[PDB]
Structure 1
Amino acid sequence: EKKPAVSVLTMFRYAGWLDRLYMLVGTLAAIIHGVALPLMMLIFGDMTDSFASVGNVSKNSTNMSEADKRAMFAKLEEEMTTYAYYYTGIGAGVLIVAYIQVSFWCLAAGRQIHKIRQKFFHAIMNQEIGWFDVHDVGELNTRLTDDVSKINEGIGDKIGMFFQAMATFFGGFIIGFTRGWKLTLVILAISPVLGLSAGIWAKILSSFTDKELHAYAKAGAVAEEVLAAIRTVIAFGGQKKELERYNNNLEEAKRLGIKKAITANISMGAAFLLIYASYALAFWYGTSLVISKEYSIGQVLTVFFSVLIGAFSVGQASPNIEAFANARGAAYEVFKIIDNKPSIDSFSKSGHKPDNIQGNLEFKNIHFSYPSRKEVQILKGLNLKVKSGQTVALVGNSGCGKSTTVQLMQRLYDPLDGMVSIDGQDIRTINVRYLREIIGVVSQEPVLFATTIAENIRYGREDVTMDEIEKAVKEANAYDFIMKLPHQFDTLVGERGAQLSGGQKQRIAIARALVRNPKILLLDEATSALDTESEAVVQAALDKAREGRTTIVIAHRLSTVRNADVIAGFDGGVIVEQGNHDELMREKGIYFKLVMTQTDVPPASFWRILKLNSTEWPYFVVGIFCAIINGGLQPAFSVIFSKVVGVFTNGGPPETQRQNSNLFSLLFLILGIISFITFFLQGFTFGKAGEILTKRLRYMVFKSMLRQDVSWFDDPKNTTGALTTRLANDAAQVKGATGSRLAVIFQNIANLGTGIIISLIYGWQLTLLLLAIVPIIAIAGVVEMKMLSGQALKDKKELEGSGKIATEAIENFRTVVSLTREQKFETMYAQSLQIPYRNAMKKAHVFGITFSFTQAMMYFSYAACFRFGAYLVTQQLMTFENVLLVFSAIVFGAMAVGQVSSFAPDYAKATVSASHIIRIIEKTPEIDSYSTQGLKPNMLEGNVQFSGVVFNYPTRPSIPVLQGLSLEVKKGQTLALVGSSGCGKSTVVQLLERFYDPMAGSVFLDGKEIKQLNVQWLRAQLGIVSQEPILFDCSIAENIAYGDNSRVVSYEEIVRAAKEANIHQFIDSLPDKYNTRVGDKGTQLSGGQKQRIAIARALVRQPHILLLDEATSALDTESEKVVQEALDKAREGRTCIVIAHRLSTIQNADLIVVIQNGKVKEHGTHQQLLAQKGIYFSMVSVQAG
Structure 2
Amino acid sequence: VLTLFRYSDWQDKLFMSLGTIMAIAHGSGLPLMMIVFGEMTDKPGKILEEEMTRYAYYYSGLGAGVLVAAYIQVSFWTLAAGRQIRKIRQKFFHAILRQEIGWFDINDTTELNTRLTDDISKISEGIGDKVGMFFQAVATFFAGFIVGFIRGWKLTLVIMAISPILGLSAAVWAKILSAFSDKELAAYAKAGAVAEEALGAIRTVIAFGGQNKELERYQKHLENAKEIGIKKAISANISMGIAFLLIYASYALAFWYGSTLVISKEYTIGNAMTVFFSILIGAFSVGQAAPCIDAFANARGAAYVIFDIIDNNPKIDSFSERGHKPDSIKGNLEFNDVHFSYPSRANVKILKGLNLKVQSGQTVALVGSSGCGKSTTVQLIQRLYDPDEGTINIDGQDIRNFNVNYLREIIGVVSQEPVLFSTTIAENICYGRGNVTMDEIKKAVKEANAYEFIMKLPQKFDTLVGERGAQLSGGQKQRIAIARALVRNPKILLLDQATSALDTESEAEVQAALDKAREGRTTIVIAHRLSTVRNADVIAGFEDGVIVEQGSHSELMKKEGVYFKLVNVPPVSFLKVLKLNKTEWPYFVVGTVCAIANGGLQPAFSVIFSEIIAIFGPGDDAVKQQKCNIFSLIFLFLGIISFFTFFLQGFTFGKAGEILTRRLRSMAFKAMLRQDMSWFDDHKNSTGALSTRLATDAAQVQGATGTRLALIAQNIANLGTGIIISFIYGWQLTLLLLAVVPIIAVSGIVEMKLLAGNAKRDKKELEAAGKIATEAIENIRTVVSLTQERKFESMYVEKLYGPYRNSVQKAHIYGITFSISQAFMYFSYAGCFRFGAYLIVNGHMRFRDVILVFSAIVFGAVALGHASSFAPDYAKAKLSAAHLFMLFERQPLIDSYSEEGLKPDKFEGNITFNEVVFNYPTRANVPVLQGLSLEVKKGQTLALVGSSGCGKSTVVQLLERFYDPLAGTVLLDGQEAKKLNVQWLRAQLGIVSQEPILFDCSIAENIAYGDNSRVVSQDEIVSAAKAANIHPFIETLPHKYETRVGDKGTQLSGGQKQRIAIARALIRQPQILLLDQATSALDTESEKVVQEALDKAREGRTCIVIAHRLSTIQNADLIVVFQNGRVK
Q: If the TM-score is normalised by the length of the shorter chain, which range does it land in?
A: 0.5 to 0.7
Residue in structure 1 matched with residue 608 of structure 2 by the alignment: 640
**Contact 1:101–1:160 under 8 Å retained in 2:** yes
1:453 to 401, 404, 426: 426
Residue in structure 1 matched with residue 550 of structure 2 by the alignment: 578
**Contact 2:482–2:498 under 8 Å retained in 1:** no
In 2: Cα distance, 1:899 partner to 1:493 partner? 48
Superposed counterparts of 1:315-464, under 5 Å:
315=290, 318-319=293-294, 321-322=296-297, 325=300, 329=304, 332-333=307-308, 335-336=310-311, 342=316, 347=321, 350-354=324-328, 359=330, 361-363=332-334, 365-369=336-340, 372=343, 375=347, 376=349, 378=351, 380-386=353-359, 388-399=360-371, 401-412=373-384, 417-422=390-395, 424=396, 435=407, 438-444=410-416, 445=418, 447=420, 450-451=423-424, 453=426, 456-457=429-430, 460=433, 462=435
TM-fit CA distance, 1:521: 3.2
* 2:59 alignment partner AA: Y
Q: Secondary structure at the match of 2:28?
A: helix
Superposed counterparts of 1:997-1036, under 5 Å:
none
Q: Secondary structure at the match of 1:184?
A: helix
Residue in structure 1 matched with residue 734 of structure 2 by the alignment: 767
Superposed counterparts of 1:707-722, under 5 Å:
none
Residue in structure 2 matched with residue 522 of structure 1 by the alignment: 494
TM-score calculated relative to the size of structure 1: 0.63
Q: Secondary structure at the match of 1:558?
A: coil
TM-fit CA distance, 1:505: 0.5
Q: Per the alignment, do residues 120 and 1142 of structure 1 end up closer, same or farther by CA in structure 2, a change over 3 Å counting?
A: closer
In 2: Cα distance, 1:750 partner to 1:146 partner? 33
Q: Secondary structure at the match of 2:393?
A: strand
* 1:456 alignment partner AA: I
TM-fit CA distance, 1:47: 0.9
In 2: Cα distance, 1:325 partner to 1:259 partner? 18
CA radius of gyration, larger in: 1
In 2: Cα distance, 1:686 partner to 1:11 partner? 35
Residue in structure 2 matched with residue 553 of structure 1 by the alignment: 524
Q: Secondary structure at the match of 1:40?
A: helix
* 1:49 alignment partner AA: E
Superposed counterparts of 1:849-998, under 5 Å:
849-850=816-817, 852-889=819-856, 892=859
TM-fit CA distance, 1:581: 0.8
2:466 is the counterpart of 1:495: yes
* 1:643 alignment partner AA: E
Q: Secondary structure at the match of 1:562?
A: coil
Residue in structure 2 matched with residue 1049 of structure 1 by the alignment: none
Superposed counterparts of 1:149-164, under 5 Å:
160-161=132-133, 164=136
1:532 to 504, 507, 520: 504
**Contact 2:137–2:282 under 8 Å retained in 1:** no
Q: Secondary structure at the match of 1:567?
A: strand
Residue in structure 2 matched with residue 69 of structure 1 by the alignment: 45
Q: Secondary structure at the match of 1:299?
A: helix
**Contact 1:34–1:167 under 8 Å retained in 2:** yes
In 2: Cα distance, 1:408 partner to 1:529 partner? 25
2:301 is the counterpart of 1:301: no
* 2:738 alignment partner AA: L
Residue in structure 1 matched with residue 1126 of structure 2 by the alignment: none
Residue in structure 2 matched with residue 1153 of structure 1 by the alignment: none
Q: How many residues align?
A: 1031
* 1:353 alignment partner AA: D
Q: Secondary structure at the match of 2:370?
A: coil
Q: Secondary structure at the match of 1:332?
A: helix
Percent identity among equivalent residues? 49
In 2: Cα distance, 1:135 partner to 1:471 partner? 41
TM-fit CA distance, 1:929: 7.2
Q: Secondary structure at the match of 1:318?
A: helix
Q: Per the alignment, do residues 108 and 348 of structure 1 end up closer, same or farther by CA in structure 2, a change over 3 Å counting?
A: farther
In 1: Cα distance, 2:1095 partner to 2:138 partner? 79
Q: Per the alignment, do residues 406 and 947 of structure 1 end up closer, same or farther by CA in structure 2, a change over 3 Å counting?
A: closer
For residues 799-847 of structure 1, give each alpha carbon's deviation from its aligned partner in whole angstroms, at most 9, with x where no partner exists. 6656655666555555565555665556656666666667766776666
For residues 308-358 of structure 1, give each alpha carbon's deviation from its aligned partner in whole angstroms, at most 9, with x where no partner exists. 157548636624643673586466325425x7685676645744323xx5x
Q: Secondary structure at the match of 1:333?
A: helix
**Contact 1:733–1:914 under 8 Å retained in 2:** no
TM-fit CA distance, 1:45: 4.2
Q: Secondary structure at the match of 2:353?
A: strand
Q: Per the alignment, do residues 253 and 522 of structure 1 end up closer, same or farther by CA in structure 2, a change over 3 Å counting?
A: closer
Superposed counterparts of 1:560-709, under 5 Å:
560-594=532-566, 596=567, 636-645=604-613, 666-668=633-635
TM-fit CA distance, 1:530: 3.4
* 1:536 alignment partner AA: A
TM-fit CA distance, 1:380: 1.4
Q: Per the alignment, do residues 653 and 47 of structure 1 end up closer, same or farther by CA in structure 2, a change over 3 Å counting?
A: farther
Q: Per the alignment, do residues 880 and 1116 of structure 1 end up closer, same or farther by CA in structure 2, a change over 3 Å counting?
A: farther
TM-score calculated relative to the size of structure 2: 0.66
Q: Per the alignment, do residues 184 and 610 of structure 1 end up closer, same or farther by CA in structure 2, a change over 3 Å counting?
A: same
Residue in structure 2 matched with residue 1156 of structure 1 by the alignment: none
For residues 549-575 of structure 1, give each alpha carbon's deviation from its aligned partner in whole angstroms, at most 9, with x where no partner exists. 332222322133111222222333422
Superposed counterparts of 1:246-261, under 5 Å:
none
Q: Per the alignment, do residues 730 and 1120 of structure 1 end up closer, same or farther by CA in structure 2, a change over 3 Å counting?
A: farther
1:506 to 481, 487, 501: 481
TM-fit CA distance, 1:51: 2.3
Q: Per the alignment, do residues 837 and 769 of structure 1 end up closer, same or farther by CA in structure 2, a change over 3 Å counting?
A: same
Q: Secondary structure at the match of 1:877?
A: coil
* 2:736 alignment partner AA: L
**Contact 1:33–1:94 under 8 Å retained in 2:** no
TM-fit CA distance, 1:589: 0.6
TM-fit CA distance, 1:578: 1.7
TM-fit CA distance, 1:790: 5.5
**Contact 1:624–1:746 under 8 Å retained in 2:** yes
TM-fit CA distance, 1:860: 4.0
* 2:326 alignment partner AA: H
TM-fit CA distance, 1:42: 2.8
Residue in structure 1 matched with residue 39 of structure 2 by the alignment: 49
TM-fit CA distance, 1:588: 1.7
TM-fit CA distance, 1:767: 0.8
TM-fit CA distance, 1:590: 0.5
In 1: Cα distance, 2:741 partner to 2:172 partner? 35
TM-fit CA distance, 1:95: 3.8
In 2: Cα distance, 1:1010 partner to 1:691 partner? 43
For residues 989-1042 of structure 1, give each alpha carbon's deviation from its aligned partner in whole angstroms, at most 9, with x where no partner exists. 99xxxxx9xx9999999x9999999x9xxx9xxx989889xxxx99xxxxx9x9
Q: Per the alignment, do residues 443 and 809 of structure 1 end up closer, same or farther by CA in structure 2, a change over 3 Å counting?
A: same
TM-fit CA distance, 1:532: 3.3
In 2: Cα distance, 1:169 partner to 1:114 partner? 34
**Contact 1:6–1:329 under 8 Å retained in 2:** no
**Contact 1:84–1:867 under 8 Å retained in 2:** yes
In 2: Cα distance, 1:670 partner to 1:975 partner? 86
**Contact 1:734–1:914 under 8 Å retained in 2:** no
2:62 is the counterpart of 1:90: yes
* 1:361 alignment partner AA: N
- When the two chains are superposed, the root-mean-square deviation of aligned CA atoms in Å is 7.8
Q: Per the alignment, do residues 102 and 531 of structure 1 end up closer, same or farther by CA in structure 2, a change over 3 Å counting?
A: farther
TM-fit CA distance, 1:873: 3.7
TM-fit CA distance, 1:379: 5.0
